[PDB]
Amino acid sequence: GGLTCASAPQGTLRILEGPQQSLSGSPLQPIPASPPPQIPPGLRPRFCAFG
Amino acid sequence: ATPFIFSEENSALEYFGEMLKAAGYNFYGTERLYSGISGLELEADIFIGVVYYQRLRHMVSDK
């Protein structure tokens, strides 16, 4: 138990978690565009001129 | 009347003109008005509609 000074280390291992990327890199999934306003069907001339 | 729902391809005036055309009115919002003072039909073709007005609280009775 003299606890002498040992030599300098050769290198460094570093352990850390890696993320999973099987999900991302996929084609994007955007929010679907709301439709442009379309005229309602069944619009008729309700007003007829008097006389 | 939400903003940014009408593009330049599908215009707002085209849409509401097709609605007015389907109702048997003019495509451009105008009508044949007459003169209530003269009796005669006005030569111009007067743009009329339905606008929602607001009454502000600033009255001349407080001023």
Instruction: Check if the beta carbon of residue B15 is closer than 8 Å to that of residue A39.
Output: yes
Residues 6-45 of B with CB under 8 A from A: 6-7, 10, 15, 18-19, 22-24
Rounded Cα distance, B8 and A34, in Å = 16
**C-alpha distance from residue B13 to each of B1, B7, B33 (Å):** 12, 11, 22
Resolution of the experimental structure, in angstroms: 2.7
Instruction: Check if the beta carbon of residue B47 is closer than 8 Å to that of residue B29.
Output: yes
Give the number of other CB atoms < 10 A from CB of residue B11.
11
B3's tokens: 């903003």
DSSP character at residue B34: B
Rounded Cα distance, B20 and B23, in Å = 5
Helix (H, G, I), strand (E, B) or coil at A6: coil
Instruction: Check if the beta carbon of residue B17 is closer than 8 Å to that of residue A48.
Output: no
Q: Residue B22 is nearest to which of A36, A37, A39, comparing CB atoms?
A: A39
Size (chain B), residues: 63
Q: List, in sequence order, every residue forming a beta bridge with B31; answer none if it has no partner.
A: B46
The method of structure determination was cryo-EM
**Which residue in this structure is represented by tokens 């003072």?**
B37
Instruction: Check if the beta carbon of residue B20 is closer than 8 Å to that of residue B26.
Output: yes
A15's tokens: 């352990």
**Which residue in this structure is represented by tokens 């939400």?**
B2
Instruction: Check if the beta carbon of residue B17 is closer than 8 Å to that of residue B28.
Output: yes
Instruction: Check if the beta carbon of residue B15 is closer than 8 Å to that of residue B6.
Output: yes
